[PDB]
Design a protein around this ligand. Structure first.
Ligand SMILES: *[C@@H]1O[C@H](CO)[C@@H](O[C@@H]2O[C@H](CO)[C@@H](O)[C@H](O)[C@H]2NC(C)=O)[C@H](O)[C@H]1NC(C)=O
Ligand SMILES: *[C@@H]1O[C@H](CO)[C@@H](O[C@@H]2O[C@H](CO)[C@@H](O)[C@H](O)[C@H]2NC(C)=O)[C@H](O)[C@H]1NC(C)=O
Ligand SMILES: *[C@@H]1O[C@H](CO)[C@@H](O[C@@H]2O[C@H](CO)[C@@H](O)[C@H](O)[C@H]2NC(C)=O)[C@H](O)[C@H]1NC(C)=O
Ligand SMILES: *[C@@H]1O[C@H](CO)[C@@H](O[C@@H]2O[C@H](CO)[C@@H](O)[C@H](O)[C@H]2NC(C)=O)[C@H](O)[C@H]1NC(C)=O
Ligand SMILES: *[C@@H]1O[C@H](CO)[C@@H](O[C@@H]2O[C@H](CO)[C@@H](O)[C@H](O)[C@H]2NC(C)=O)[C@H](O)[C@H]1NC(C)=O
Ligand SMILES: *[C@@H]1O[C@H](CO)[C@@H](O[C@@H]2O[C@H](CO)[C@@H](O)[C@H](O)[C@H]2NC(C)=O)[C@H](O)[C@H]1NC(C)=O
Ligand SMILES: *[C@@H]1O[C@H](CO)[C@@H](O[C@@H]2O[C@H](CO)[C@@H](O)[C@H](O)[C@H]2NC(C)=O)[C@H](O)[C@H]1NC(C)=O
Ligand SMILES: *[C@@H]1O[C@H](CO)[C@@H](O[C@@H]2O[C@H](CO)[C@@H](O)[C@H](O)[C@H]2NC(C)=O)[C@H](O)[C@H]1NC(C)=O
Ligand SMILES: CCCCC/C=C/C/C=C/CCCCCCCC(=O)O
Ligand SMILES: CCCCC/C=C/C/C=C/CCCCCCCC(=O)O
Ligand SMILES: *[C@@H]1O[C@H](CO)[C@@H](O)[C@H](O)[C@H]1NC(C)=O
Ligand SMILES: *[C@@H]1O[C@H](CO)[C@@H](O)[C@H](O)[C@H]1NC(C)=O
Ligand SMILES: *[C@@H]1O[C@H](CO)[C@@H](O)[C@H](O)[C@H]1NC(C)=O
Ligand SMILES: *[C@@H]1O[C@H](CO)[C@@H](O)[C@H](O)[C@H]1NC(C)=O
Ligand SMILES: *[C@@H]1O[C@H](CO)[C@@H](O)[C@H](O)[C@H]1NC(C)=O
Ligand SMILES: *[C@@H]1O[C@H](CO)[C@@H](O)[C@H](O)[C@H]1NC(C)=O
Ligand SMILES: *[C@@H]1O[C@H](CO)[C@@H](O)[C@H](O)[C@H]1NC(C)=O
Ligand SMILES: *[C@@H]1O[C@H](CO)[C@@H](O)[C@H](O)[C@H]1NC(C)=O
Lengths: 441, 436, 197, 49
């Protein structure tokens, strides 16, 4: 296997590389939140409609209560995960009527009122990209079938699936409220009352946060808006074509379905008895020398139930950890701006937008990536009148003839005046100082 | 019921899931095939002569009714054992292929007619399989097979090269070479005839007296039964929690008309979890299917027992019009029947809720029912159900040239509680398991 | 309050109590008491009963140990989170949003609790907002002026520059703004004057 | 130093070793060796062991 592309960097003691252009890049991150909630009827799984097996199972009484207690704890934890992931704010901010956002186009992430479910285009694509193999109402299993669907088998063997507390419309409403808050109020709605601000000034705040002066935005607003719209459309057509994404939600669903199917099909084991059917044992033997066979079957099925419950608890711990990470990212990247490296996408973080997904959340991270760098000659300081001068912010660069001072992330040369630099000491201790002149206004 | 599931007399406020405790079967039916001929026990227990043990006689038995109460007057059996089936369950079963193997053996060798035995009869004359199913019957016949002067008409094999296979017969009379010199088909030194005759005098010991042995071999194969027990059929009961007996297969559940095609020489059709569902009625040739009598998916919503005693019942994935059929409300107590229908009936995506009224308001979730529906105890007092409210509706005045600036502030303190450690425990296994 | 510490204690007590009360199970034997088995039966045909009891009690102990390990993992995760919060909010000031309380974090104080810790977070919450009219930049002499920190606001007649989190209007001088380019590319620029000291 | 990597390795090795040495338990049978049971008993009344 190949580690990656071989590369090298031209390093010297008096050379810098300064970017001259930039790109706005949006990336997707998918995080699971919850999983399926299940309930097990032990006396119906082990002894289906048998009174003698129930009387024998009455000795093993506390095990059923223990298993049901563990499963109910798992289910309420599954509800609580969504509760602290999505219900961050308690004000349902309505979407604005006017859509003058300085050229930015949020049509594909805002809800569409035409659909019966108030969901965006991306949310509809995300729901259509997950199969979500179930809705089987009782009564359809009754008659006209021999339970090939295996949901009837799960229901007849005492295994049920509980619906989640929050339906999809409420989660969509929460995401819509967060989206309306984050584009009309900035980060102010996450720390108190929402204060309105024009979107261009908000993006100027973000650019000042990442270390770029705000006049770059006011000079390249049209280019930035075009890049953002094009990249949003690129994500839309990427998600509308391939189904290789959303693997985590899909294989959580697959794991739960496979566990339930294995628990159903483990009922065909003899467990060291003469048969795997209770009816044959009850119909071929009298009351004595039949308790041993039923005892073996009871022990085997109890072991299977305990194994299933233990595996469910182990999976629930990991799901809870993922939900905690999702809640942290929701609070730290949607409701604010994060200085942590690679926490919310490659590059320097600007914004984030949430979208719902089947048992999960999808973050669209908007980030800033520098591009089109150039070589320059660089000095640590300038000795003008026998004293050293250091830049207040940015670095000194040279284009071969003259020296300028510029900001670090964008190329914007300026005349070296006394308002850009400060004086500290004489030009005798700094290694590599360069003679030049400092203008005075 | 929810007091009984928690095994306590006090119930806290919330929702609970309960086990089945309502319906109990009352009726039982039998659906044996109609066979009228009595089985010929006499023709095999009352024959004028039997076969030798080395040439034991095998006879097929079919299309008869095994009553075996007609043998109580004629013969008394000294040995009667059964393997794979209890003796008291013989009247409730139907077999597939019954084979009767009959012979006469010495009274001291009756113990060798058993699986896993060894000796002379079990090695060279008659051997049973290890997984043998069926019964072995043996009785004394000293007054029939023995006569004055000696009855020498019964023979047994004394020598053989190797032990017999199960259910194998050998009637060859070749000369056995005990020594190293070849026999050349003539008797002599170290050359013996393999068969020897019993001497059955009427005055010898009990261990040297003739005994008659009959071995019955059966099987519960998935095929139409030919040999049945002495039981009378019963009329079909449908749409009720009943016990059923179909060709010796016992079960419990609800019988309902169904349809499927079935191969003729097969009888039983199972499910994924090895549960029998396809049978052929031997009297009407109608294939019905069996559904479980128990129903799961019943939840009880209650406040605390310190508060009140009213409850609400949620049936999962059940239409509100089909609730009484699904829970068999006809054969229930009226106190359970009042929760089957009524005025307080609500249909939610989680199922059917009975016992709480549906208000048009919206509050915070007190008791979570599911699918956006919650319930609470409000004001007399009653239990109400509603859709939970996400929060206060709000809007923000956005324009392209307007900003909002704070002019004052507040200092706010708040708590955050976090667990750190828990209880450290240790066990003593040799004291917990085997105390002193 | 303090529901988490209380139900951790309750969970441990309930687990120990059910481990004690599980000793009254036959596990398919003739009795749940070893003394009755040892008193009514000889050395042989009594080892099977004791073997059934031993298997059942060993299964109970293994189940208890497994659930204890599963609970211990979650407790350790919570302890790691508490240690991180103590390091990042008591020993310093945190810029992470909603990590140590609603609003902008100022201070935090720790308190002990039975098997737990309680953090008192002291935060700053703005209040009593007012509407204003804003502008991206100011064109004074054919060139654009952008504020150094804060934004331009207007009370209807005049223009001021102020900090973002508090209302404190000031005269727009050359020491509050900086010049970059002409007033031709900035959308929504506003004609005004800039004082010079 | 490096106690964490060392005791992870030690824990894995100890788990494998105790899984190997748990094969010497009778589990309520007459012997811990399958060959003895198959050599002293027939097809029936040896399936329980
Ligand atoms: C910075 O990059 C952008 C994007 O590549 C450049 O904008 C392109 O400019 C060319 C020529 O003017 C046009 O043909 C393209 O259509 C532009 N792209 C977009 C997306 O608008 C921009 O010119 C670059 N700036 C510098 C100084 O190199
Ligand atoms: C935002 O981008 C879309 C995508 O190009 C623009 O086009 C609209 O796309 C939607 C699909 O959701 C269609 O229903 C509309 O009919 C499209 N409009 C047009 C004019 O083709 C959309 O116009 C952009 N928004 C704005 C305000 O320009
Ligand atoms: C380095 O940059 C300076 C400033 O832009 C350049 O100086 C100007 O060069 C242009 C020719 O391209 C002249 O028309 C201007 O009069 C010059 N300005 C001054 C103040 O002298 C300089 O040429 C650049 N050097 C290189 C090697 O590109
Ligand atoms: C930078 O400029 C200073 C002048 O301020 C130079 O210092 C003088 O250099 C000459 C030539 O070596 C000496 O004769 C003087 O005695 C120096 N004066 C002082 C005060 O040091 C310095 O050499 C220049 N450095 C470079 C690298 O050009
Ligand atoms: C079934 O017949 C075969 C064929 O004769 C028997 O096998 C022979 O057994 C004798 C006695 O040990 C040996 O001397 C021969 O060498 C065997 N021949 C072969 C081809 O194997 C076999 O013993 C018979 N089965 C039984 C149960 O007696
Ligand atoms: C900012 O809020 C504080 C807190 O309400 C105000 O202080 C109150 O002022 C009124 C009138 O002077 C007093 O009656 C209260 O007793 C004060 N409260 C406290 C806690 O001291 C303050 O006046 C507000 N400032 C502005 C400019 O509105
Ligand atoms: C906007 O603010 C300015 C500055 O505070 C106000 O101008 C002053 O108004 C007061 C009357 O309230 C006069 O006494 C001062 O002489 C004014 N100062 C100057 C420099 O003119 C102005 O009135 C405010 N406008 C509104 C509509 O509130
Ligand atoms: C802002 O002020 C400038 C003057 O500095 C205005 O520009 C002049 O506008 C008049 C009237 O339209 C024209 O006749 C002049 O030719 C313009 N001069 C220049 C140099 O552009 C500008 O119109 C003012 N803008 C607003 C919105 O009031
Ligand atoms: C002609 C034989 C037909 C066999 C049909 C199937 C067998 C099922 C019934 C077996 C009972 C055989 C008689 C045993 C009587 C025991 C009574 C006693 O202890 O005295
Ligand atoms: C003098 C004894 C030396 C042998 C000791 C070793 C044990 C092996 C032989 C045990 C069986 C003894 C003869 C029993 C014959 C089978 C019984 C029957 O007729 O059914
Ligand atoms: C800077 O110079 C080095 C050495 O000449 C060269 O390899 C590198 O590509 C240059 N950087 C750019 C951005 O051209
Ligand atoms: C940079 O390295 C070169 C190579 O030796 C050396 O000549 C020069 O003096 C160095 N400059 C500085 C400022 O260290
Ligand atoms: C048995 O056979 C004897 C002799 O033929 C006969 O007298 C007797 O009636 C028979 N008994 C039965 C039950 O058939
Ligand atoms: C059969 O029963 C009758 C009376 O029921 C009796 O007289 C007769 O002796 C019995 N048969 C035998 C063989 O004892
Ligand atoms: C009796 O057996 C016949 C033969 O199959 C069958 O057709 C019939 O339904 C059975 N029952 C009655 C009551 O005749
Ligand atoms: C059962 O309820 C559903 C609503 O979820 C409804 O669509 C369906 O028609 C109902 N069934 C009957 C038989 O009325
Ligand atoms: C700002 O103006 C809008 C529209 O007039 C109004 O709805 C809003 O309440 C105002 N804000 C404040 C703080 O007065
Ligand atoms: C703000 O919006 C109004 C109405 O759409 C428009 O007339 C005005 O020119 C806009 N101003 C700016 C600076 O975009």
């Amino acid at each position: 296997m190949s580690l990656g592309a071989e590369n090298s960097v031209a390093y010297s003691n008096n050379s810098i590389a300064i970017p001259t252009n930039f790109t706005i890049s949006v990336t997707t991150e998918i995080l699971p939140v919850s999983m399926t909630k299940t309930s097990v009827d032990c006396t119906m799984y082990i002894c289906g409609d048998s009174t003698e097996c129930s009387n024998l199972l009455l000795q093993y009484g506390s095990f059923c209560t223990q298993l049901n207690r563990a499963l109910t704890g798992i289910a309420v934890e599954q509800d609580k995960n969504t509760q602290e992931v999505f219900a961050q704010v308690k004000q349902i901010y309505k979407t604005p009527q006017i859509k003058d956002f300085g050229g930015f186009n949020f049509s594909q992430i805002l809800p569409d009122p035409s659909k019966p479910s108030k969901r965006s285009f991306i949310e509809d694509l995300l729901f259509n990209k997950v199969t979500l193999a179930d809705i089987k109402q009782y009564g359809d299993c009754l008659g006209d079938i021999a339970a090939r669907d295996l949901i009837c088998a799960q229901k007849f063997n005492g295994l049920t699936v509980l619906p989640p507390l929050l339906t999809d419309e409420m989660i969509a409403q929460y995401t819509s409220a967060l989206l309306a808050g984050t584009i009309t109020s900035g980060w102010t709605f996450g720390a108190g009352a929402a204060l309105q601000i024009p979107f261009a000034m908000q993006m100027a705040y973000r650019f000042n946060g990442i270390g770029v002066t705000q006049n770059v935005l006011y000079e390249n607003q049209k280019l930035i808006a075009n890049q953002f719209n094009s990249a949003i459309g690129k994500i839309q057509d990427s998600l509308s074509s391939t189904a290789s994404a959303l693997g985590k939600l899909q294989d959580v669903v697959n794991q739960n379905a496979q566990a339930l199917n294995t628990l159903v099909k483990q009922l065909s084991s003899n467990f060291g008895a003469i048969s795997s059917v209770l009816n044959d044992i009850l119909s071929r033997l009298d009351k004595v020398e039949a308790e041993v066979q039923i005892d073996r079957l009871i022990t085997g099925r109890l072991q299977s139930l305990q194994t299933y419950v233990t595996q469910q608890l182990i999976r629930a711990a990991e799901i809870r950890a993922s939900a905690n990470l999702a809640a942290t990212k929701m609070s730290e990247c949607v409701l604010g701006q994060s200085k942590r490296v690679d926490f919310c996408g490659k590059g320097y973080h600007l914004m984030s937008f949430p979208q719902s997904a089947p048992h999960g959340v999808v973050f669209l991270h908007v980030t800033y990536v520098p591009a089109q760098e150039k070589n320059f000659t660089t000095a640590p300081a300038i000795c003008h009148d026998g004293k050293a001068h250091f830049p207040r912010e940015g670095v000194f660069v040279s284009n071969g003839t003259h020296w300028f001072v510029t900001q670090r992330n964008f190329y914007e040369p300026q005349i070296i005046t006394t308002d850009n630099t400060f004086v500290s000491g004489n030009c005798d201790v700094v290694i590599g100082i360069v003679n030049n002149t400092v203008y005075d206004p | 019921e929810t007091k009984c599931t928690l095994k306590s007399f006090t119930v806290e406020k919330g929702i609970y899931q309960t086990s089945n405790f309502r319906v109990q079967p009352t009726e039982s039916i039998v659906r044996f095939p109609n066979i009228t001929n009595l089985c010929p026990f006499g023709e095999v227990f009352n024959a004028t002569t039997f076969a030798s043990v080395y040439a034991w006689n095998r006879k097929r038995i079919s299309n008869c009714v095994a009553d075996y109460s007609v043998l109580y007057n004629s013969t008394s059996f000294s040995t009667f054992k059964c393997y794979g089936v209890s003796p008291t369950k013989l009247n409730d079963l139907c077999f597939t292929n019954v084979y009767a193997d009959s012979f006469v053996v010495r009274g001291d060798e009756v113990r060798q007619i058993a699986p896993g035995q060894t000796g002379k009869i079990a090695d060279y004359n008659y051997k049973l399989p290890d997984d043998f199913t069926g019964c072995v019957i043996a009785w004394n016949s000293n007054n029939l097979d023995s006569k004055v002067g000696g009855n020498y008409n019964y023979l047994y094999r004394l020598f053989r090269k190797s032990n017999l296979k199960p259910f194998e017969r050998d009637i060859s009379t070749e000369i056995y070479q005990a020594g190293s010199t070849p026999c050349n088909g003539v008797e002599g030194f170290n050359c013996y005839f393999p068969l020897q005759s019993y001497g059955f005098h009427p005055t010898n010991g009990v261990g040297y007296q003739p005994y008659r042995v009959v071995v019955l071999s059966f099987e519960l194969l998935n095929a139409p039964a030919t040999v049945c027990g002495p039981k009378k059929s019963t009329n079909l009961i449908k749409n009720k929690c009943v016990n059923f007996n179909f060709n010796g297969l016992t079960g419990t559940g609800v019988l309902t008309e169904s349809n499927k095609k079935f191969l003729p020489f097969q009888q039983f059709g199972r499910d994924i979890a090895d549960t029998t569902d396809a049978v052929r009625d031997p009297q009407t040739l109608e294939i019905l299917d069996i559904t479980p009598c128990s129903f799961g998916g019943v939840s009880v919503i209650t406040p605390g027992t310190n508060a009140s005693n009213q409850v609400a019942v949620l049936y999962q994935d059940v239409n509100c019009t089909e609730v009484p059929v699904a829970i068999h409300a006809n054969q229930l107590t009226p106190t359970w029947r009042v929760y089957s229908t009524g005025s307080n009936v609500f249909q939610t995506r989680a199922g059917c809720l009975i016992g709480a009224e549906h208000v048009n308001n919206s509050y915070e979730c007190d008791i979570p029912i599911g699918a956006g529906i919650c319930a609470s105890y409000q004001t007399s007092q009653s239990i109400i159900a509603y859709t939970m409210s996400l929060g206060a509706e709000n809007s923000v005045a956005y324009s392209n040239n307007s900003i909002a600036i704070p002019t004052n502030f507040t200092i706010s303190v708040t708590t955050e509680i976090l667990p750190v450690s828990m209880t450290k425990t240790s066990v003593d296994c040799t004291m917990y398991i085997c105390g002193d």
